[PDB]
Each structure stands twice: as C-alpha cells, then as structure tokens.
C-alpha cells in the first residue's frame, strides 16, 4: 500500500474532534495530498488539499496537520456533527516530470470510516418484543452512545443506528435483532446495567 491509513473505523461524540491518520510513500520532491469524503450514496466529495510546500491547510472545520519529515498527513474534523459521518479517503497526487498536466493519478488509501456518536440526554436502555402484523423482532433502543452493539454468535443482529426526532428534538440509538426466540438471550455479547427487558 503506497498510501496507508491505519484506522479502519473511528468513533467519536458530537461537538468533539477526530483525527484521521494518513501516511504516504513517494520519491517525488513536490506533490499534493487530498482528503475525500465518501457518502453512503457512493458520492466522492472533495474536502481539503495539502501541497508539498504549503502551510498546514485549514478549511472550515476540516484541518490537516502536515509533517513532511515523517510523510504524515492527518485530517482532523474540529467540531463534529451527525452529518460528518462517512468514510474518508486520503489521496496523493504525483506529478509527471514537467508538471501536473491533468494526467495525474490520485493514489487512494483504503479509507477511514467515521461514526459520530449522538448525545444521549436521558437514556433508559430496554429490549422490546415486536410482533409481526401479518403473522405469528427484538429491538434494543434508547441506550448511550458509548456502548456498542455486537453481532451474536448465531441469529441476525443489526449494527446500531441513530434516529432523530425533528419535531420533538429527540435523538436515540436503535438496534434490532431477529431469528427464524427470547430477547434477553438474543444478544450473546455487548452486555448497560439498566434494562427493562
């Protein structure tokens, strides 16, 4: 891997900072490092550019600490918000001998997935039993951002998701699990101490 991102997935709360590590390998004297944001809609969006000879680049809440010696370029999102959640890609343009004649490849790293953690005001985690309308699922919701939902050994257990009430200004975390079945015994792991289950 020419460009390298050590971080596979990063999780940080809202209104906080997250630093995304990126390293590169190049023999060129002058170059450019790019940072891209990949949406779940698979849209690649440009964020900020860092040149070989430049001051540390700062655009909006996106700031990068550049170290030319260690070949390190690190994107830091200053004030986190829910919309900031996406996979971020570090990319390094390398010039042809004469110039950057619009032929230049941008070498991509594997990307760093960023999951922003919503702020839970009054959490009361509980497991509920939902009966099917048509015939004959268990959701774990209203839990703090710090605790992470883990897939059972198996049983299908979904990853956590953030739900936002616009009219009530209410935000909550929800994760559902089902199999073709007790709710308490549904989650093999991931363990809060308050449960209405």
């Amino acid at each position: 891997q020419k460009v390298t991102q050590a971080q596979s997935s990063v999780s940080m709360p809202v209104r906080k900072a997250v630093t995304l590590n990126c390293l590169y390998e190049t023999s060129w004297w002058s170059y450019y490092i790019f940072w891209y944001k990949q949406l779940p809609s698979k849209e690649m969006i440009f964020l900020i550019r860092q040149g070989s000879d430049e001051q540390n680049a700062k655009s909006g809440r996106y700031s990068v600490n550049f170290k030319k010696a260690a070949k390190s370029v690190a994107l830091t999102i200053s004030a986190l918000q829910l919309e900031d959640s996406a996979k971020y890609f570090c990319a390094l343009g390398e010039p042809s001998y004469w110039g950057f004649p619009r032929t230049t490849r941008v070498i991509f790293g594997k990307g760093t997935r960023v999951t922003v953690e919503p702020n839970i005001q009054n959490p009361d985690p509980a497991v509920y039993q939902l009966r099917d309308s048509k015939s004959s699922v268990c959701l774990f919701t209203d839990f703090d951002s710090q605790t992470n939902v883990s897939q059972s050994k198996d049983v299908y257990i979904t990853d956590k998701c953030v739900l936002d009430m616009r009219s009530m200004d209410f935000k909550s975390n929800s994760a559902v699990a089902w199999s073709n079945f007790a709710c308490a015994n549904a989650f093999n792991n991931s363990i809060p101490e308050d449960t209405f289950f």
Partner: protein, 231 residues
Amino acid sequence: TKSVIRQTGSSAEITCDLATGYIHWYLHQEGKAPQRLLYYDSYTSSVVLESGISPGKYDTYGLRMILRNLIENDSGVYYCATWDEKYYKKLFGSGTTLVVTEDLKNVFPPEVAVFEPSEAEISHTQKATLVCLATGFYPDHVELSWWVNGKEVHSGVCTDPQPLKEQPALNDSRYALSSRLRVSATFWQNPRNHFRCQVQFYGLSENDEWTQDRAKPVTQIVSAEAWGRAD
C-alpha cells in the same frame, strides 16, 4: 443512483455524469483502495490504460465506457473523473454500482415486513417505534422508504447503512436490511394514520434472459403496511 447487474461473460455499459479536459475512470471495491483504470482524450480521442490492464477490456468513446469480458471481480463502484479548469483538484461525478455473478439465478427480490410497536415501549418511553425489514434479496441494490398517509416521511426514520449478510463467507449470499420509524405514542394510538414501508428493488431488465422456473426478478416495489391501534 444507478445500479447495474450483469452475468459473467456478458458486457456492461457505464455512463458518466459530470459534463472538457481529460476524463478518468476509477474503480472502487469494498475493503480495497480506489484505483484508476484508464483515462481518455477529448481531442485526440487517444485511450491510455494503466499498468497491468489488458487492452480490449474497457472501451471508451464520447460520455460512455463499455466493459467487454466481465467476471465476478469486475464488481464494485465505478467513478468518472476530471481535473478542474481553474483550481487543482480531482472531481468524481459517478455513483455507479456494478455487480457480476456466474448465473442470474442468484438474483432475488426483497421480502418486506412491518412490525407493530410494543405496549411496553408505549407505556415506558411514551414513544412508538416501528421497524421494517427487507430480507433475502440479491443483489445489494435496494431503496427503502417510509410513507405516512400517502406522503414520505424523512423525519424520525433510521435505516441501516450497510445491509447485513444472511450467509457468511458466501459471495452470492442474499442480504437483509432493517429500518426504523419512531413517532409519538399519541400518533400510533390514532387508527386514522396509515404507516407504509416501501422498498424499491432494482432487478433484471427486459433484455435480460430468464431460463429458470420461478418468476423473473424484474425491478419492482415490494411494500408492507400497518395501522394505528388505540387499545
């Protein structure tokens, strides 16, 4: 966005979104870093392919790009790219997702089921949570939507970003996707309110060939509904 599903050995025609300069084509696969395939000329129309790529694999002409001999490893997301006229940066226009399989018998439409809120969740948090789950669908291309009283509600809804796989360690395995809608308890207790979970699925086209016995997995909308309970 656009979804393309083809069979191994067939051809796939890729379209480019952004509308001068040199047009580049990038390939992104899951867990893998996005790489460049080739780039094409506007004036000379000269096509230049990267190292390791055999000629005749990708055809490019004014903006469309054609793939000729497809295999399962051609799967993943294809971007079209260009450098800005003024500033120096690389813009990607395309949202195109391509999946390739040995046989189209692996393609299945989703099964949509809506689940009613618990009497416990109504009594405790004073909020009703409706969850919809689409199961046993291949390929990965699906769009879930919540509809209340004929209108689509983006508020209070949450859908899993990555659909879970039903059969681990399997390439052709079907997927499952879950989504949630939370509304006030007072809203669910009103029977006049209609909750509908609609899942759009993109399947095989009319030009595709279906040899098998079961129904052809054409592009379709599978839906499920629920009504409010007062007591």
